[PDB]
Amino acid sequence: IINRQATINIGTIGHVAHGKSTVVRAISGVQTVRFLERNITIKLGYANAKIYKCQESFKSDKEISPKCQRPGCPGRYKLVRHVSFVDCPGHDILMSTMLSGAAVMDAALLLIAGNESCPQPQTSEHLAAIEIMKLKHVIILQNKVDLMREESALEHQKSILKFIRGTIADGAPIVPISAQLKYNIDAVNEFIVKTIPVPPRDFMISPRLIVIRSFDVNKPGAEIEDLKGGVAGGSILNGVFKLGDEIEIRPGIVTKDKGKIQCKPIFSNIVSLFAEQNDLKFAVPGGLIGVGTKVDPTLCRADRLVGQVVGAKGHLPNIYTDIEINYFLLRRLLGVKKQAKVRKLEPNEVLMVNIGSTATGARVVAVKADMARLQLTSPACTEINEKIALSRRIEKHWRLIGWATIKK
Amino acid sequence: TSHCRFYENKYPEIDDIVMVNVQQIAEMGAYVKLLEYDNIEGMILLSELSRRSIQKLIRVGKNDVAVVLRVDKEKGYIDLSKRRVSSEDIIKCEEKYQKSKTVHSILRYCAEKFQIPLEELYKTIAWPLSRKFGHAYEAFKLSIIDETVWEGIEPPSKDVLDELKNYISVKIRADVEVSCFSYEGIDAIKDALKSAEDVKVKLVAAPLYVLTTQALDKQKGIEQLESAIEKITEVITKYGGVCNIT
């Protein structure tokens, strides 16, 4: 069996205490990163699944084990795909991480529990976000079905169907699966192969990398004369990387505190690539790879590198402090428990603008009709156009309003 | 079991000094156990004990310095006197007693370890140490400084001797904070370590480095730590990073 890395990024959405990590575990086997130094940087974890098919019935086709002994046929499984999971939490406080996750995602998985109430605002918000950020491949999954009645589940399904009609997602498949009992995952696997294809990707496009997580490889007990370099957990959308290249983290860093800053973006040479489980020479875009570079282990510690752009040497993108946005607003607010009408944008107000993966606070200067000018506090970079989600404050915490695009 | 003589012989001589620990009083005087010559009882009558509250001063537990007058070398009969002892030599006597005590302490570990009689051990020790040199404590001290007295007698147990030596035979904590933002940092850290370690330096997490500096005469630990700090400061300024010292 060949040790091929991740091909396409699949993300999972839900709610707090509903069950997402458990579902992930059921799907794959290797436990999630979340659940001080290691793993702790963002809200998303790290998981990997296997797609191997046995074609020699009905729904039973794909499996989780490398060896086929369970269904009947003793023959070895055929290699189809290998996928990486991006598990994003569905909490009312933390959403920036989710947004960041969304930017890299190519496939989405919705989770709704049976026993709880049918209309949930957070789930709706998530769906809206998915719709916004160039995602159409959505599979609806029912979580807790075993604790529900014979007709109640059907009713719930009907309600769901009624709800999802006017949205961009038209032909979304619905699967009921148990997380604690471990059943019906084969159908899900089959669907993964059926409904979702891999988009065309080539070597010709300029390298662009997005870092979500940060890692320091330091072990207690062992002497200091045996050290390991700083690892940046970064996912790639476009551009193939190989071992032996120069990488730079774009936005900038503060090194001296009197004296104006002039220091260039953080340069680092690649030491070792961590994909799936074992090290590989080539990096195929469409997965999260722990890129171990010559960067400090102290820098890759905690909340320092959350959603930052990474480029290869011989390419020049632009850095902006003032940004030109083309926005579109929604009718009523999504996320609030009660629904409130969206007000027109007022000059000079603190609003959270999420350009791809960056979590930045911006203030409005001029409003016309569709075009808006924003002043940023923390530095941000622009490459092409980018997919932007906008968030405002009305009551206590952040609420989503609509979508935006950079006009440059 | 604790027994055997302190100097050379079981029975004391004439005019020699002995220290006594009193258990019970008021019958004849004090017929109590000795600490300078064996554990055989020595007696004072109610006249030689007083020099100048007579019952209160001694009673139970307290130590007394007394000179030997009458000896009966047959089975164990010693006579003591307190009045004759002069104040000038009392300090000397005390010192001697202390030395004896130390010697006794030294000959206990052996008894404990190899489960053999203490008296035999004492006999084996006293021949080159307590006879040729003078007193035993000084000989022991000499040996510890430069080994010359242990050479005289062959050791039946070297392990015991080693243990004794060990018995006869300062870490200062420091914290250095690392928070670099430069291009290369690991190498710099390694370099720093190569100048700070060579005593014991350990890694805990990522930003904190814990180091323990050993001092010879307690005050010496300040001179090295400061130097190390200076070296660390020198290290990170050139590349373009920062390291802080609390």
XYZ file of C-alpha atoms in Angstrom:
654
model
C 0.000 0.000 0.000
C 1.392 3.381 -1.125
C 1.786 6.174 1.450
C -0.063 8.937 -0.436
C -1.080 12.117 1.427
C -4.385 14.087 1.580
C -6.175 14.933 -1.695
C -9.287 16.945 -0.699
C -10.193 18.849 2.505
C -13.486 17.902 4.203
C -14.868 19.929 7.136
C -17.471 19.152 9.806
C -19.968 21.552 11.450
C -22.390 21.294 14.394
C -23.108 22.636 17.888
C -21.629 22.474 21.430
C -22.174 19.147 23.323
C -23.891 17.692 20.201
C -20.991 15.474 19.070
C -18.446 16.136 16.311
C -15.195 14.758 17.748
C -16.949 11.454 18.474
C -18.229 11.329 14.880
C -14.697 11.996 13.600
C -13.358 9.181 15.800
C -16.031 6.826 14.459
C -15.073 7.761 10.889
C -11.265 7.421 11.257
C -9.689 6.095 14.500
C -6.903 8.539 15.441
C -8.041 10.842 18.282
C -8.468 14.625 17.812
C -5.857 17.268 18.767
C -8.202 19.246 21.063
C -10.665 17.408 23.413
C -0.230 23.818 26.685
C 2.575 23.490 24.099
C 1.423 20.817 21.613
C -1.833 21.149 19.583
C -3.009 24.292 21.451
C -3.102 27.182 18.944
C -6.602 27.350 17.452
C -9.974 25.608 17.712
C -9.601 23.148 14.834
C -7.929 19.778 15.348
C -6.206 17.267 13.082
C -7.651 14.006 11.762
C -7.265 11.670 8.784
C -9.645 9.209 7.129
C -9.211 6.365 4.631
C -11.182 5.767 1.413
C -10.636 2.196 0.183
C -13.273 0.460 -1.969
C -14.089 -3.237 -2.387
C -15.657 -3.762 -5.832
C -15.815 -7.423 -6.918
C -23.788 -4.332 -2.365
C -26.643 -1.849 -1.882
C -24.908 0.602 0.457
C -22.085 -1.474 1.937
C -19.058 -0.728 -0.242
C -16.426 1.388 1.508
C -14.615 0.345 4.686
C -12.393 1.791 7.415
C -9.945 -1.097 7.782
C -7.074 -1.735 5.325
C -7.871 -5.463 5.198
C -11.256 -6.763 3.997
C -12.578 -9.456 6.365
C -15.877 -7.932 7.590
C -18.413 -8.057 4.695
C -17.533 -11.409 3.033
C -14.914 -11.038 0.280
C -11.320 -11.968 1.313
C -9.685 -9.878 -1.470
C -7.592 -6.765 -0.773
C -9.168 -3.290 -1.008
C -8.590 -0.945 -3.967
C -6.918 2.451 -3.448
C -9.282 5.378 -4.121
C -8.469 8.418 -1.917
C -6.980 9.655 1.368
C -8.653 12.611 3.134
C -7.873 15.053 5.969
C -10.571 16.228 8.407
C -10.892 19.819 9.657
C -13.146 19.744 12.743
C -14.466 23.224 13.592
C -16.372 23.934 16.868
C -19.906 25.384 16.783
C -19.828 27.732 19.783
C -21.372 31.225 20.091
C -18.106 32.806 21.358
C -15.536 31.185 19.014
C -16.243 31.510 15.269
C -13.024 33.000 13.824
C -11.389 29.562 13.822
C -14.434 28.108 12.048
C -14.246 30.871 9.447
C -10.542 30.156 8.917
C -11.323 26.459 8.458
C -14.016 27.308 5.920
C -11.549 29.155 3.604
C -9.567 25.935 2.925
C -12.575 23.531 2.897
C -13.889 21.951 -0.326
C -16.528 19.637 1.217
C -18.893 20.186 4.175
C -20.680 17.895 6.663
C -23.650 19.189 8.705
C -24.549 17.587 12.064
C -27.926 18.004 13.819
C -29.033 15.983 16.880
C -32.513 14.404 16.911
C -33.719 14.881 20.513
C -33.133 18.668 20.609
C -35.160 21.458 18.907
C -35.553 21.530 15.100
C -34.682 25.175 14.275
C -31.216 26.151 15.565
C -29.686 29.568 14.692
C -26.015 28.579 14.907
C -26.484 25.752 12.410
C -28.299 28.130 10.055
C -25.443 30.629 10.371
C -22.939 27.869 9.575
C -24.969 26.882 6.513
C -25.042 30.507 5.355
C -21.272 30.752 5.783
C -20.815 27.564 3.749
C -23.045 28.986 1.006
C -20.984 32.191 0.976
C -17.463 30.665 0.846
C -17.739 28.792 -2.513
C -19.098 25.504 -1.119
C -21.978 23.538 -2.677
C -21.045 19.945 -1.741
C -22.968 19.578 1.550
C -24.085 16.321 3.225
C -26.685 16.495 6.028
C -26.127 14.038 8.904
C -28.476 13.112 11.764
C -26.543 12.521 15.006
C -28.728 11.106 17.821
C -31.349 8.826 16.224
C -31.215 5.854 18.662
C -32.901 7.866 21.463
C -35.731 8.943 19.098
C -39.118 7.460 18.094
C -40.159 5.802 14.786
C -42.159 8.723 13.339
C -40.478 11.611 15.192
C -37.272 11.163 13.191
C -39.280 11.134 9.958
C -41.051 14.330 11.021
C -37.695 15.957 11.776
C -36.405 14.929 8.343
C -39.506 16.414 6.713
C -38.990 19.663 8.616
C -35.351 19.775 7.480
C -36.461 19.241 3.874
C -39.000 22.054 4.200
C -36.286 24.349 5.573
C -33.683 23.622 2.843
C -35.158 24.697 -0.528
C -34.366 28.395 -1.150
C -30.648 27.994 -0.337
C -27.819 27.518 -2.899
C -27.404 23.822 -1.939
C -30.046 22.022 -4.034
C -29.286 18.272 -4.126
C -27.961 17.655 -0.612
C -27.933 13.986 0.559
C -29.288 13.127 4.037
C -27.845 10.217 6.089
C -28.741 9.020 9.636
C -25.646 7.827 11.577
C -24.843 6.749 15.149
C -21.706 8.191 16.787
C -21.551 6.121 20.003
C -22.814 2.822 18.502
C -20.660 2.976 15.301
C -23.032 2.127 12.407
C -24.062 3.209 8.852
C -20.692 4.939 8.108
C -20.336 2.826 4.923
C -23.192 4.765 3.318
C -21.497 8.054 4.236
C -18.246 6.803 2.709
C -20.079 5.827 -0.479
C -21.663 9.275 -0.653
C -18.240 10.891 -0.219
C -17.155 9.111 -3.427
C -20.426 9.659 -5.324
C -21.484 13.308 -4.800
C -18.144 15.099 -4.219
C -15.540 15.233 -7.040
C -11.956 16.585 -6.958
C -11.561 20.027 -8.670
C -8.817 20.452 -11.355
C -5.453 21.493 -9.867
C -2.125 22.037 -11.661
C 1.588 22.806 -11.081
C 1.389 26.080 -13.084
C -0.268 28.197 -10.340
C 1.931 30.266 -7.971
C 2.415 28.791 -4.431
C 0.045 30.054 -1.705
C -0.056 28.594 1.827
C -2.312 29.286 4.844
C -1.136 28.466 8.400
C -3.860 27.620 10.954
C -1.992 25.764 13.746
C 1.441 26.117 15.396
C 3.626 23.356 16.886
C 6.763 23.193 19.038
C 8.570 19.835 19.271
C 10.028 19.776 22.799
C 10.027 16.776 25.157
C 10.530 16.871 28.974
C 13.316 14.704 30.443
C 15.695 14.720 27.457
C 18.756 17.015 27.297
C 18.821 20.351 25.405
C 21.621 19.169 23.036
C 18.899 17.170 21.209
C 16.537 19.828 19.785
C 13.872 19.944 17.051
C 12.858 22.967 14.937
C 9.576 24.908 14.918
C 6.673 23.300 13.047
C 3.986 25.376 11.294
C 0.744 23.447 10.694
C -0.262 24.889 7.325
C -2.804 23.920 4.670
C -2.355 24.487 0.915
C -5.046 25.407 -1.641
C -2.744 25.983 -4.653
C 0.962 25.404 -5.385
C 3.023 22.212 -5.079
C 5.890 22.243 -2.545
C 9.004 20.041 -2.358
C 11.702 19.641 0.335
C 14.404 22.315 -0.052
C 12.712 25.707 -0.522
C 12.593 29.160 1.119
C 9.327 30.170 2.827
C 8.226 33.571 4.200
C 5.386 34.479 6.598
C 3.972 37.681 5.065
C 2.201 40.085 7.537
C 5.259 40.977 9.674
C 6.622 40.724 13.224
C 7.700 43.053 16.075
C 11.268 42.365 17.282
C 12.247 45.665 18.978
C 10.286 47.777 21.482
C 11.522 53.893 20.260
C 12.725 53.071 16.732
C 10.577 52.581 13.622
C 9.941 49.038 12.333
C 11.509 48.126 8.968
C 12.221 44.371 9.347
C 11.129 42.075 6.494
C 8.591 39.140 6.604
C 9.748 36.065 8.589
C 12.084 33.994 6.367
C 12.464 30.244 7.031
C 13.878 27.213 5.188
C 11.913 23.923 5.159
C 13.492 21.152 7.278
C 10.826 18.388 7.356
C 7.219 17.961 6.176
C 4.725 16.161 8.439
C 1.854 14.700 6.393
C -0.685 12.169 7.777
C 1.762 10.115 9.925
C 5.129 9.851 8.108
C 7.459 12.314 6.320
C 7.153 12.853 2.543
C 9.199 14.669 -0.139
C 6.292 16.119 -2.173
C 3.337 18.193 -0.931
C 0.076 17.799 -2.889
C -2.293 20.795 -2.311
C -5.653 20.068 -0.644
C -4.598 19.086 2.889
C -3.133 20.272 6.200
C 0.627 19.625 6.509
C 2.820 20.269 9.572
C 5.577 22.196 7.775
C 8.661 21.997 10.023
C 10.866 24.990 9.196
C 13.957 26.808 10.583
C 11.574 29.097 12.562
C 11.869 29.379 16.387
C 9.998 26.882 18.642
C 9.169 29.831 20.960
C 7.295 31.598 18.121
C 5.156 28.497 17.423
C 3.836 28.212 20.997
C 0.240 29.488 21.394
C -1.962 32.362 20.097
C 0.549 34.049 17.752
C 0.111 32.472 14.289
C -3.654 32.148 13.696
C -4.600 32.582 10.016
C -1.496 33.985 8.300
C -0.398 33.770 4.643
C 2.827 32.009 3.588
C 4.675 32.418 0.265
C 7.676 30.905 -1.530
C 10.796 32.899 -2.513
C 10.504 34.589 -5.928
C 6.947 35.937 -5.557
C 5.613 39.319 -4.375
C 2.089 39.844 -2.907
C 0.743 43.137 -1.471
C 0.184 44.191 2.166
C -2.735 46.526 2.995
C -3.752 48.731 5.943
C -6.696 50.376 4.142
C -8.949 47.985 2.185
C -11.554 48.472 -0.576
C -14.577 46.183 -0.106
C -17.690 45.458 -2.202
C -20.358 44.222 0.236
C -23.837 42.657 0.096
C -26.211 42.641 3.093
C -28.873 40.168 4.278
C -32.466 40.929 5.379
C -32.526 39.457 8.917
C -29.740 38.417 11.323
C -28.599 34.789 11.658
C -27.170 33.392 14.914
C -29.455 35.162 17.418
C -31.750 32.909 19.512
C -35.945 35.766 18.081
C -34.731 37.413 14.854
C -33.570 41.024 14.415
C -33.592 43.273 11.323
C -30.219 44.250 9.804
C -29.498 47.999 10.062
C -27.591 50.130 7.518
C -23.852 50.639 8.151
C -22.930 53.602 10.375
C -19.601 55.518 10.040
C -16.877 55.019 12.710
C -17.750 51.691 14.392
C -15.662 48.656 15.432
C -16.584 45.654 13.243
C -14.863 42.281 12.752
C -13.886 41.597 9.125
C -12.740 38.063 8.238
C -10.776 37.974 4.969
C -10.230 34.248 4.325
C -8.450 33.170 7.517
C -7.431 36.508 9.119
C -9.247 37.739 12.242
C -9.039 41.548 12.049
C -10.910 44.482 13.624
C -11.842 47.212 11.136
C -13.479 50.669 11.202
C -15.648 52.153 8.421
C -14.755 55.540 6.871
C -17.033 56.006 3.818
C -20.327 54.350 2.788
C -21.909 54.863 -0.660
C -24.204 51.982 -1.750
C -22.081 48.897 -2.557
C -18.477 50.085 -2.030
C -16.967 50.538 1.451
C -13.582 51.720 2.763
C -12.166 50.113 5.928
C -9.234 50.990 8.212
C -7.442 48.011 9.808
C -5.710 47.918 13.217
C -3.740 44.687 12.624
C -1.931 44.163 9.245
C -3.477 42.022 6.471
C -2.351 40.802 3.023
C -4.149 40.566 -0.345
C -3.185 38.239 -3.227
C -6.078 37.854 -5.724
C -9.628 38.690 -4.498
C -10.390 36.446 -1.454
C -13.676 35.305 0.135
C -14.756 37.592 2.999
C -17.335 37.144 5.773
C -18.447 40.227 7.743
C -19.399 40.337 11.446
C -20.893 43.137 13.586
C -21.652 43.820 17.277
C -25.171 44.660 18.513
C -25.726 42.517 21.646
C -22.739 41.266 23.727
C -20.951 39.020 21.164
C -20.332 38.942 17.374
C -23.089 38.407 14.770
C -22.776 37.692 11.018
C -24.279 40.214 8.550
C -23.240 39.379 4.948
C -20.513 38.827 2.334
C -17.760 40.969 0.749
C -15.124 40.976 -2.046
C -11.892 42.998 -2.493
C -11.958 45.218 -5.610
C -8.299 45.331 -6.728
C 24.508 -3.902 71.545
C 26.673 -1.054 72.894
C 29.683 -1.876 75.115
C 33.559 -1.954 75.138
C 36.224 0.513 76.379
C 36.905 3.970 74.872
C 40.703 4.395 75.149
C 42.789 1.200 75.594
C 41.802 -0.598 78.829
C 38.556 -1.432 80.685
C 39.748 -0.184 84.102
C 40.723 3.506 84.680
C 44.129 4.556 86.089
C 45.213 7.077 88.787
C 44.560 10.865 88.427
C 42.761 10.388 85.058
C 39.473 12.163 84.245
C 36.076 10.546 83.536
C 32.620 11.856 82.555
C 29.533 10.288 84.185
C 25.824 10.308 83.303
C 23.754 10.129 86.508
C 20.609 7.942 86.586
C 19.616 7.836 90.294
C 20.807 9.720 93.409
C 20.556 9.892 97.270
C 21.489 6.568 98.923
C 25.315 6.539 99.189
C 26.073 9.172 96.537
C 26.186 8.274 92.835
C 27.121 4.794 91.551
C 26.500 5.415 87.831
C 27.711 4.425 84.323
C 30.771 5.998 82.653
C 31.277 7.610 79.219
C 35.099 7.959 79.232
C 36.026 4.416 80.371
C 33.661 1.500 79.515
C 30.075 1.056 80.849
C 31.037 -0.386 84.277
C 29.610 1.628 87.214
C 31.738 4.147 89.152
C 30.909 5.473 92.624
C 31.205 8.778 94.509
C 30.385 9.163 98.224
C 28.378 12.168 99.526
C 31.421 14.399 100.311
C 33.830 14.404 97.324
C 30.971 15.408 94.975
C 30.401 18.808 96.651
C 32.781 21.675 95.918
C 30.756 24.652 97.223
C 21.503 23.628 96.744
C 23.128 20.163 96.765
C 20.242 17.871 95.695
C 18.962 20.067 92.832
C 22.165 20.523 90.761
C 22.606 16.914 89.548
C 19.613 14.515 89.998
C 18.800 12.775 86.654
C 20.348 13.107 83.171
C 23.085 15.702 83.764
C 26.824 15.152 83.176
C 29.627 15.558 85.741
C 33.430 15.805 85.439
C 35.323 13.792 88.088
C 38.878 12.593 88.848
C 39.662 8.927 89.685
C 41.158 8.274 93.148
C 40.781 4.560 94.012
C 40.896 1.635 91.554
C 40.282 -2.049 92.313
C 41.408 -4.078 89.280
C 39.626 -7.413 89.829
C 36.087 -7.264 88.358
C 34.970 -3.597 88.243
C 35.335 -1.126 91.124
C 36.109 2.565 90.430
C 36.113 5.564 92.820
C 35.532 9.164 91.693
C 35.949 12.694 93.139
C 34.607 16.081 91.972
C 36.218 18.525 94.461
C 39.857 18.010 93.340
C 39.263 19.000 89.674
C 40.601 22.469 88.749
C 38.794 24.951 86.453
C 41.756 25.379 84.045
C 41.796 21.751 82.803
C 37.976 21.324 82.832
C 37.743 22.647 79.258
C 40.451 20.192 78.171
C 38.579 17.348 79.865
C 35.383 18.368 78.069
C 37.226 18.422 74.743
C 38.610 14.945 75.426
C 35.112 13.690 76.249
C 33.782 15.176 73.012
C 36.561 13.478 71.052
C 35.738 10.157 72.712
C 32.061 10.594 71.842
C 32.953 11.321 68.222
C 35.139 8.200 68.104
C 32.271 6.133 69.496
C 29.903 7.570 66.885
C 32.407 6.682 64.150
C 32.410 3.054 65.424
C 28.646 2.412 65.049
C 28.011 2.279 61.283
C 30.346 -0.738 61.046
C 28.436 -2.443 63.852
C 25.152 -1.748 62.073
C 26.208 -2.912 58.576
C 28.015 -6.308 58.631
C 26.240 -7.615 61.802
C 29.529 -8.285 63.667
C 30.467 -7.437 67.342
C 31.393 -3.806 68.066
C 34.193 -4.644 70.514
C 36.174 -6.515 67.860
C 35.759 -3.578 65.472
C 36.965 -1.190 68.172
C 40.000 -3.405 68.792
C 40.788 -3.468 65.075
C 40.489 0.336 64.824
C 42.375 1.344 68.019
C 45.670 -0.431 67.110
C 46.996 1.874 64.341
C 44.863 4.962 65.169
C 44.465 5.275 68.967
C 47.858 3.786 69.959
C 50.471 5.095 67.480
C 49.124 8.606 66.752
C 47.552 9.626 70.091
C 43.813 10.247 69.788
C 41.643 8.663 67.096
C 39.597 11.629 65.863
C 42.693 13.523 64.768
C 43.983 10.399 62.995
C 40.650 10.068 61.195
C 40.843 13.720 60.147
C 44.366 13.166 58.825
C 43.185 10.134 56.860
C 40.346 12.112 55.337
C 42.776 14.867 54.303
C 45.531 12.467 53.118
C 45.183 8.670 53.530
C 48.086 7.308 55.625
C 46.673 5.728 58.833
C 44.236 3.255 57.174
C 47.265 1.703 55.390
C 48.566 0.193 58.676
C 45.765 -2.358 59.167
C 44.182 -4.605 56.497
C 40.414 -4.020 56.011
C 38.006 -6.999 56.367
C 35.244 -4.787 54.898
C 36.120 -2.107 52.331
C 32.428 -1.322 51.693
C 32.035 -0.248 55.338
C 35.098 1.991 55.016
C 33.672 3.533 51.844
C 30.374 4.192 53.634
C 32.236 5.841 56.508
C 34.132 8.039 54.027
C 30.856 9.035 52.379
C 29.368 9.925 55.763
C 32.416 12.054 56.572
C 32.053 13.839 53.222
C 25.218 24.292 46.758
C 22.579 24.405 43.989
C 21.372 27.903 43.018
C 18.299 28.206 40.755
C 18.094 30.526 37.721
C 15.465 31.295 35.056
C 16.161 32.544 31.507
C 13.222 33.534 29.265
C 13.466 32.998 25.491
C 11.055 34.837 23.142
C 12.851 35.177 19.773
C 11.313 36.447 16.510
C 14.416 36.040 14.280
C 15.071 33.805 11.222
C 17.342 31.229 12.918
C 16.874 30.685 16.647
C 17.421 27.023 17.487
C 21.104 27.282 16.550
C 21.456 30.400 18.704
C 19.822 28.584 21.624
C 22.234 25.669 21.165
C 25.182 28.073 21.141
C 23.921 29.690 24.349
C 23.589 26.267 25.971
C 27.169 25.444 24.939
C 28.276 28.477 27.041
C 25.842 28.193 29.992
C 25.889 24.441 30.794
C 29.669 23.890 31.089
C 26.381 22.602 35.756
C 22.924 20.988 35.368
C 20.536 22.654 32.880
C 17.084 21.205 32.061
C 14.286 21.916 29.556
C 10.672 22.099 30.809
C 8.342 23.489 28.098
C 9.321 26.085 25.429
C 9.807 29.707 26.618
C 11.389 28.821 30.002
C 14.842 27.339 30.650
C 15.694 26.118 34.169
C 19.359 25.976 35.245
C 20.976 25.029 38.571
C 24.444 26.462 39.282
C 26.714 24.664 41.775
C 28.779 26.731 44.238
C 31.937 25.684 46.111
C 31.918 28.279 48.932
C 28.281 29.542 48.580
C 29.285 33.078 47.431
C 30.841 31.848 44.137
C 27.468 31.285 42.383
C 26.887 34.989 41.589
C 30.030 35.331 39.402
C 29.121 32.570 36.913
C 25.382 33.210 36.615
C 25.961 36.853 35.692
C 28.528 35.800 33.076
C 26.038 33.324 31.616
C 23.383 36.057 31.463
C 25.844 38.353 29.679
C 26.655 35.614 27.174
C 22.947 35.049 26.527
C 22.461 38.777 25.943
C 25.383 38.802 23.507
C 23.902 35.809 21.650
C 20.506 37.112 20.433
C 21.239 40.835 19.725
C 23.099 40.152 16.441
C 20.531 38.007 14.559
C 17.384 40.048 15.327
C 15.627 38.430 18.300
C 14.947 39.008 22.009
C 15.674 37.065 25.215
C 14.614 38.398 28.635
C 16.087 37.897 32.127
C 13.827 38.239 35.199
